[model samples]
Target chain A: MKIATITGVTKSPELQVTKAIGALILSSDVALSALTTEKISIYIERGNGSNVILANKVLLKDFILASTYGTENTQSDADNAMIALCELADEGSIYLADKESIKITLEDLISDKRYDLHGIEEPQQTNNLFFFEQKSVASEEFNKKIDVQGFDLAIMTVDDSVSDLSYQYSNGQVVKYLPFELQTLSRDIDPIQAVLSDGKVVQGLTDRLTLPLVAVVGIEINKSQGSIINFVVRCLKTV
Target chain B: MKIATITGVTKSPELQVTKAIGALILSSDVALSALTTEKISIYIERGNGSNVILANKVLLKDFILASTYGTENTQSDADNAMIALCELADEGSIYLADKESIKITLEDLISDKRYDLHGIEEPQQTNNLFFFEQKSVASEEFNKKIDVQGFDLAIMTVDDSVSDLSYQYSNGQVVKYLPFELQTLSRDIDPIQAVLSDGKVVQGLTDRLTLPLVAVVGIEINKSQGSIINFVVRCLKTV
Candidate 1:
């Protein structure tokens, strides 16, 4: 139940071939450095908009680009990859959106592993959170003050007292807990967009959170506003 | 107005007659201490059943005896006396079952005055609290602890914030001042009895109050289990 950014990758690479920049080239020894955009700047913030980790590199639907690919960022690819990873024999998974020869089809991950949590609190499974400030980033202005991206917060409760805390005590230990999630101060703030009179940077979160407070878990954002500065968040209490 | 207990009393007497010892006797001048059985311990307590004052010889409908009087407790005298007092003069206010030869009428004071406060905040009258361990002081109680009288603590909201408070300022050097009242505690535990093997007490409050809150002013008691305790208790800020 913990969230993770894509950290590593191994592919069915045509190692024998070579490669280049925008060209359908071959895979030389350094195909990664030759074509991939290094270091993504994502982030984690609170609801009142306070930055903890200003940015991070997440693996949202990321795979070895199917030996040669672009961002599918579609729903099916992400969902299939997640379930497939959960079915791993010994720590297994993918980023997202396979190529035409997607040897492991989304259909394959779909018809499997559903009743999995079987009373277990921590299992080896994870998903990534993402955000992309599309519109303003595509605007004509040289300086926009509110084009936040990545997970933004949403609604949650402010109370839990006495016996209502983490109802998962086991023997002498607390087996599970849930993190306080976020919600907007506005149910009606027009989506992520703002501008200043003179010099500025795109930003607008009245509140936000932390790292160890922590992590990206899943994606459900179709159309957005401003919360996680810009990613998908709905993290459990460090589960 | 605030609540106060009846501490003592003075009365009119013919001052001559035969009396007895806790038995059936005839009338006498100082019957209260002489021909009278003497002590009556009536009390009023709040929800936890704590006592502030124990004996209040209230005029709960008092009337004189014909040739004799036992429970001598006439119901009408106490009721009329109170209403008569409410009709007071330059300020200024019966007995149970007394004869037509009665000398004083509570109405004498009524014809004297009425300095009603005008379009001022508002005013209707008093008493919105009640209590009596009577039903069990209670009829069937083989043993009952701390039987209190009157609905002691009746705190009503004087005005509601803006429209509330006795909005009084120095007109041309104001002669008098204001009132206080308000709280959030709810009350109701036991109306009649509490048990303890020993000879102490296990009780509940009949009614209670706090300070700084503002409210109204009066009193009424009946077989009715409604407003007003055993006597009048619409006390003011500091009358």
Candidate 2:
């Protein structure tokens, strides 16, 4: 629940931007942890005396990569970052959230391929196998705990708005548009009042700034209190 | 059982090179699998007409990182890779094999802190926990296997020969020398005949090229035709 400034934007010379495609925030007022599974909405003041979300929905990682990998001081540096991002984004690294989502247990989710699996959070790639392991917390386990396979992934919809602007991944894959979402977790917090890129100020915004969802892998479910879990699994509603 | 060539060398201009600190091999003749636990010793043709081990012992990963991360076309490029390697090597990411290696079962190895634990092969880093997981392959386990914790790491001796020269890691740690070793698994393979970096040829180099041991984590034991095991744990005898 804090405010942030748009310190940087990742864009290309080819893009004639009325709004930023991706922007970097100056403050960590919004926890990066929540940005993984939950949506973030940031309202910035628009030139028309109303608040418009600066980042309607951009990948958090892409924004991070975009901001740090190259300085946005020059249009050329920004263009290089955009090209690098497009190559990665096209390869299915980024996904857009939709209004639809499903909540189920881990067992129930893996019982059948309920939705498009982005992939496990952390894949251990050996010479022979690429697998994931989660700690077995069962009581009767060996005195020395062993590794096992488990599930944790993200869900997103394909954005096909711009017919001429499909994104291409580095691996020769392509997508119409970089998918994104503006949904957020907080409904009660006061919307952060912030300045927009275009020198405008809007206030009634109550949601945290949000970005596109990327690899939301390895979400840990353990805590010291040991809450009784009835196998709670949350899946995004894919359209 | 294969032969390789010294395709490239990773070195710095500051160092006088009677031999290469790290060299790249162009053949898979030496199984990388063997290189992880077993040491590799490559005999190269020296200016003295005898086959000298070009890479007496160097870190495989540092060599890999050094080889691919930067093209050593210019002396400046080579220096950059060497500096990068030095930074990572100093931070404890790279370990040299010692002649004083130990052999024991996995149970006995972790029972006590027999040697330095470089770390687990693949550490799943979440927002809160840094841990390793392996598949729990017990007879009475759940229908779906689970992840568990176990031991896997590398051991190395701290090098301290050079009075003035030392390696510095990015994290501000420092070491006098980059530790290394010269060892191998096969005692019977015909020596490979190959060209050395100095354009000399050696034929009596019966052993495969060896390298510094780093991240010997996640050594899998299970096989298709389950070999009977009496809990054989191989540990490098640390001095």
Candidate 3:
């Protein structure tokens, strides 16, 4: 009975693969606006600095346009017709392992409609598919089985994507993180515990912490048979 | 404006795969309770009849056990001489193709804390990952683009597990069925309309259609240059 009404969801993004370049090149379907045109950006950071992995870019369009072609669009047209263009349903589904597979944005983008009908803040021009490799996106402290002790701390390689336990120290962290050394800073700034997967014990930093907003007051680590799950963060400064 | 809070979701279920038989035969870890045990059932149907694509399944106990060797465990064994038998983390993340590659079950027993602290009725026994294939499932109308028209009906092909449009008439027919002709009731029924990916539109018959329940009174397909979406149900007999 571990799983509850609250089902566990994978935070990891699914990978994507583009059609072979040659296959999509000659098709007049490029004019198929709905399929070819949405612009979007992807950002990634290996360590400290974040740079646009690729930005202000349109997806699926170039990938398909640069690819190959087919002869005629099967549908008929009148003598008054502009040359007919054949837009073939994807020539085939291919799983390319090499690159642009790990796509990232927000769950909202991943789980919702083909067109964003409610976004007032995101750029209108940016709309299209995205892909990134797991290794590239999650490099900073991407440890899977991270272990930390109450009294001492040191750097160690755990699993995929390197990361540290003491802080968001890991280079690339995934999942909201099952807080090791979890604790209270509720009324103050220990940070709001986010609603947990269980929907009960919510503890997590809601937004990224900036300088004046939050400071590491104190660290209270508890000892456990396993890695300590709770920590008491003492606020050094006030809001 | 390209994205939509009103989203479009693919109803298509990705495929599955299974464990190698001789591989997970024996292991004490199968006793791991959550990781090794509960059983699940998978259901599928082609046209007129339903069949067991695969079923009466048990979870993964042996796979974790003998896949490799590991010693036991005891949190407090200072003076306790008995050797504990704690299992090892998986030999590795396994992705086996050619076999049960499609992977079944929506959830994964992945990451962080080992047990569900809250799951206080799901079988404590329902652990292990499952995967299966398409040929193994949904055999007849597996075509990606199954099209139906007025000229010929009586099920040449259909969308999802169940559908209508062609079946409206023509135990023999042709193309362009605005629908009225698509009925024969030859297929035994169960009702399961998944919420459309759009979230806004939901249409499906629940349970099975019977005089006991409302019948197909009308259809509610959206206005498409192409086709309408929902089928209207009417209570033909007294419930």
Candidate 4:
């Protein structure tokens, strides 16, 4: 699954409708078929509090305020219109509360997919690792220092034969496979105040986002000769 | 299992024997039956390096330098005599090496026993938690500042009915039960240098010891009115 941020809101004068800021941009990469009628879990983060809002019974189209494309379009319009009634305003308030956050999460679009690689050693996942050089970037957008720990690090595993580079088979066909959907245990650390579709309010603070990293499973210490040393190790997966 | 520190070694002139400093002292709490002839894992920590020494084939009696007590006692004498040949001296040397460490771990006696408490909500275990005051202590013996984290917090779980205080049953039999053998995920952070029974040398630094803590599972936000609030929570287990 892919997650695209809702940077800002937009309105279509011809259609007289509004939608999330980057909805159309995300539609370019995300397959339209993946947008099911299933409800989504929306998480909002702020600097003082955070919240988890469940939009019950509202499909993706309704939540994002989309127009109809088929016979089911009528139902989508009704749901979309209902969501449009509650606007995300510039008063630093959401619905009826004065709570502004920096980050958001769409759980349905960014669901975790688990894979079991039996017999293959799974690497340990952590936000920080010792072998790699550490870096940090200041996000002026969120006004926070985003430490480049394990950024975009997916908690994944693989066999000894797996590699990031493409491989050619005996038949002369080249294949490149990667675990693109795997994600790290990342979270946002902003405060949030959200109003659920059912009128329930949520408020709290979240943790820092997940960092990318590599996991080393085991090491083999080769026999030492004189003053020299040798060691061999295997990485479960590059991602 | 209980672990007693080796304060100082002693010589029994009349019996012609030398033993670990706290050998006889530990005998007071540990049942004699619990002391088996099984080999135990010994861990030593220091400020420079650490080591794990596997004393293979040697029984508890030999490792602790104890005299024979029964028909199987003669074999104990042979093993005890072997360990007696390697003395822990004031010169900070052991088995022809200059390595002095602070703490030691006897793995066999302090083994972790896992319990499967299905249907009961297991609490999240960590070295730190909120809702509690923090404290620390300085150890004159080891000359280290030991922060009071979750020092003895054993990774365990319990039902809502469980409590640290004992209760009486309807049958009039006032029985009290507690998870005594449970232990926390504590580790030592001292450097170590060890010599195994097979003459192999191991050295490294260990992490800090495990801290004790409490785990809170779920909470109930009771109905609230003006200026009043109430909440209920269940602790998996109190250590």
Best by lDDT: 4
User: Candidate 3 regions off by >4 Å?
Assistant: A1-175, A179-239, B1-37, B40-59, B71-239
lDDT of each: 0.20, 0.22, 0.22, 0.23
Candidate 1, TM-score vs. the true structure? 0.14
Please identify which of the two predictions, 2 or 4, would achieve the higher lDDT against the true structure. 4
Ranking by TM-score: 2, 4, 3, 1
Give the interface RMSD of candidate 1: 33.5
Question: Model 1, stretches more than 4 Å misplaced?
Answer: A1-239, B1-229, B232-239
Q: How far off is residue A79 in model 1, in Å?
A: 61
Q: What is the TM-score of chain A alone in each candidate?
A: 0.17, 0.18, 0.18, 0.20
lDDT of 2 by residue, A1-239 (tens): 01112213322111122221121122222322223332222322334333323233344432332222111110111111111111111112122223211111111111211111111111111111111111223222222211111222221221222112232333445443221222232112313222222223232222222222233322222222322211212122211
TM-score of chain B, per candidate?
0.16, 0.18, 0.18, 0.20
What's the TM-score of candidate 4 when only chain A is evaluated? 0.20
Chain B TM-score for candidate 1: 0.16
TM-score for each model? 0.14, 0.19, 0.15, 0.19
Error of 2 at B230 (Å): 30
RMSD over all Cα atoms, model 2: 26.2
Measured against the true two-chain complex, the DockQ scores of the candidates, in the order shown, are 0.00, 0.01, 0.01, 0.01
Model 2 achieves a DockQ score of 0.01
Best by TM-score: 2
